[PDB]
Structure 1
Amino acid sequence: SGFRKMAFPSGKVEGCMVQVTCGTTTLNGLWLDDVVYCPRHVICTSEDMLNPNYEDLLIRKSNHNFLVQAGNVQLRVIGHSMQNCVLKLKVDTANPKTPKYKFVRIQPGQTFSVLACYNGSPSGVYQCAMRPNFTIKGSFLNGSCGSVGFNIDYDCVSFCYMHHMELPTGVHAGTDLEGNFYGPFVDRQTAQAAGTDTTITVNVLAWLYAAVINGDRWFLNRFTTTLNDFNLVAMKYNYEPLTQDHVDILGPLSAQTGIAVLDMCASLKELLQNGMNGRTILGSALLEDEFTPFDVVRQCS
C-alpha cells in the first residue's frame, strides 16, 4: 500500500536527450531516429527575444550553425527546418536508442512525467498535470528548454510536452512535439500571463478514491448528491464542472471501493464547505488534483 506521486521510469527518454547549441544559446533536444527536435528560440539572440521574426532568422542559418552533442560524440547536422515553434535538425546518424514512440497532444487535466535536463544531461524526473489554463507547475531553470514530458504505455513512449518558457507567476509553458503551444502563449520574451486557473474535479475525486483504497475514510458520509447540485457547489469553489464522461471514467474506482461517484461527490462537497479541521488525506492538508483516475488505478491494486 501507500500512495505517492510517481513518475514513469525515464531511461527510454534519457537515451534521446542531446545538447543543441546555436551561437551563444544552448538548450536540449530530443533525438529520435535521424532527427533532433528542439525549441526554435535556440536561433534567437539577446536582442531578437523581444519580437523575433523566426522565418527570417532561419533563412540566415546554415547546417554548420547548429552544434549537436550526443554525450561526447558530435552529431553532424545535414538539414534543418521549422514546424510551428519547434526546430527539426536532420542528422547523419540515427539514434540507436530510439524507443518505440508517438507524439500526443494532451487535454487539460492529464498528467505526464517531465525529464528535466541541462546541457543534454538529465538531472531529475517529476510528475506534472496540464492545468486547465494550459500551464504546468514545474521546476525549470535557465537551460532547461527542450526538456520533454511523456507517458509510457507498454514500452511505447508518448511524448506530449516540450519546455519553452516560464511565466511571471512562476509557472511554465510549452508545446506539443509538433511545436504547437498549449494555451494562448507565444515564444517571445514579452508580457504574457497565465489566465485564472481552476481545480480539476475529476482528479480530486480520483484521489479521494485512492485515499479510501489506502484506508483514509474519515471524510466519507452517508449522503448522496445529484450531479446538478454538485456542480453548483463546484462553481462556487472554482472547480471544473463534473461531466457524465468523468463519472464513467471513475467507474472502476467506484466499483473497487463500493462507493458510488455521486456518493463521493457528497464527501467532496462537505470538504469544500467545512475544510479538514486539522486532519489530513494521504498526507496532505489540501485537496490534491494532479492525479488522474488512470494514475490512481495504476498505483492502487
Structure 2
Amino acid sequence: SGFRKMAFPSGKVEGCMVQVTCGTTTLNGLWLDDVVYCPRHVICTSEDMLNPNYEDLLIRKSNHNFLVQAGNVQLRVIGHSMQNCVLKLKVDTANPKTPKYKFVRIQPGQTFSVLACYNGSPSGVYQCAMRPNFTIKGSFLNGSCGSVGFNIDYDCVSFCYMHHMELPTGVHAGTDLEGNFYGPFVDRQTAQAAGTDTTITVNVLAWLYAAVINGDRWFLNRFTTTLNDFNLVAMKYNYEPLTQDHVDILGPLSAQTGIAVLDMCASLKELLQNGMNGRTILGSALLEDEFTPFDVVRQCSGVTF
C-alpha cells in the first residue's frame, strides 16, 4: 500500500555523467560508448547567449578546446560535431559503465526521471512530466544544463531529455538526445513565454485508479458520462481532451478495479465542479497529473529493473 512520486533507480545513468568545459563554460555531459553528448551552448559565454551564431562560434573551436572529465580523470577528445542543439564529442575511450540504451522523443503527458547534476556529479533524482506546453517543471540551478531525463525498461535506459534553459517564469526547456527542443524554445537568452499549462487528463484518471487500488474511494460518485460530455467540462477546466486512445490505455486499470473508464470520468467531472471540500486523495489536496497509466501499473505491481 501507499503511493509515491517514484523515480527509476539512477545508478545506470550516474555511471554516464561527465563534466564538459569549453573555455570558461562548464556543464554536464552524457558519456555513452565513445561519445559525450552535451548542450551546444558549452561553446558560449554568458554574453554570447544573448544572440549566438553556433556555426560561427564552432569555427573557433578544435577537439582540444573541449575538456571532458569523468570521475576526476581526463578523456581525450578525437572529434566533435553539432547535431541540432547538442554537441557530440568523440572520445578515445568507450564508457565501461555504458548501459543498454535508446534515444526516444516523448509525447506531452509522458513522465520521466531526472538526474539533476552539477560539474558532472549527481545532486538528486526526481520524477517529472513533459507538460502539454512542452515545458517541464523541474528543480534546476545554474550549472544543471546537460542533466538528463530517462525511463528504464528492465535493463535498457531510454534517454528522452537533456536540460538546456530556464524560462523567466522558472519552468524548464530542453531537447531530446538528437538535440531537438521540445516545443518552440531556442537556446538563446531571449524572453520566451510558455503556452497554457493544461492538466494531463489521462494521468489524473490513472492516479484516481491508483487511489481506488489504495482504498481512497470517497470521490467515487453515482454517475457516468460520455467522452463528448466529459470533454466539454475538461475544456472549461483547462484539462486536455480525452480520446478513445486514452480510454484504451486505461483498460487494465478499469479491469483491475471494475470501474468503467467513463464512470471514472464522471467522478473526475464532479471533483472539477464540486472541488475537494478540504479532503485529500493519496495525501494530495489537488488532482495529480504526473503519473501515467503505465507508471500506476508499474508502482501497483512492483515491476523491477
Q: If the TM-score is normalised by the length of the shorter chain, which range does it land in? A: over 0.9
Deviation at residue 73 of structure 1 after TM alignment: 0.8
Deviation at residue 197 of structure 1 after TM alignment: 1.4
Counterpart of 2:144 in structure 1 is 144
Distance of 1:143 and 1:258 partners within structure 2: 48
Counterpart of 1:10 in structure 2 is 10
Distance of 1:162 and 1:72 partners within structure 2: 22
Equivalenced residues, count: 301
Counterpart of 1:158 in structure 2 is 158
Q: What's the CA shift string for 1:162-203, capped at 9, x where partnerless?
A: 000101111100000000000000001011111111110000
Distance of 1:48 and 1:138 partners within structure 2: 25
Give the share of equivalent positions with the same residue, in percent.
100
Deviation at residue 161 of structure 1 after TM alignment: 0.1
Counterpart of 2:295 in structure 1 is 295
SS of 2:247's partner is helix
Deviation at residue 14 of structure 1 after TM alignment: 0.4
Distance of 1:165 and 1:24 partners within structure 2: 18
SS of 2:12's partner is helix
* Structure 2 counterparts to residues 279-290 of structure 1, below 5 A: 279-290=279-290
Deviation at residue 87 of structure 1 after TM alignment: 0.3
Of 107-116 and 51-60, deviating more is 51-60
Deviation at residue 278 of structure 1 after TM alignment: 1.1
Deviation at residue 222 of structure 1 after TM alignment: 1.9
Deviation at residue 45 of structure 1 after TM alignment: 1.2
2:239 is the alignment partner of 1:219:
no
SS of 1:289's partner is coil
Distance of 1:126 and 1:198 partners within structure 2: 21
SS of 1:69's partner is strand
Of 198-207 and 220-229, deviating more is 220-229
Q: What's the CA shift string for 1:44-73, capped at 9, x where partnerless?
A: 112211111000111110111111000111
Counterpart of 1:66 in structure 2 is 66
SS of 1:181's partner is coil
Distance of 1:164 and 1:277 partners within structure 2: 40
Distance of 2:104 and 2:278 partners within structure 1: 41
List gaps (5 residues or longer) in structure 2. none
TM value normalised by structure 1: 0.99
Counterpart of 1:174 in structure 2 is 174
Distance of 1:13 and 1:38 partners within structure 2: 14
Of 10-19 and 220-229, deviating more is 220-229
Distance of 1:217 and 1:233 partners within structure 2: 22
SS of 1:174's partner is strand
Distance of 2:145 and 2:247 partners within structure 1: 37
Distance of 1:23 and 1:189 partners within structure 2: 19
List gaps (5 residues or longer) in structure 1. none
Of 42-51 and 136-145, deviating more is 42-51
Q: What's the CA shift string for 1:233-253, capped at 9, x where partnerless?
A: 001111110000000000000
Counterpart of 1:35 in structure 2 is 35
2:99 is the alignment partner of 1:99:
yes
Q: What's the CA shift string for 1:196-228, capped at 9, x where partnerless?
A: 111100000000000000000000012111111
Misfit runs of 4+, over 4 Å: none
SS of 2:49's partner is helix
RMSD: 0.6
SS of 1:300's partner is helix
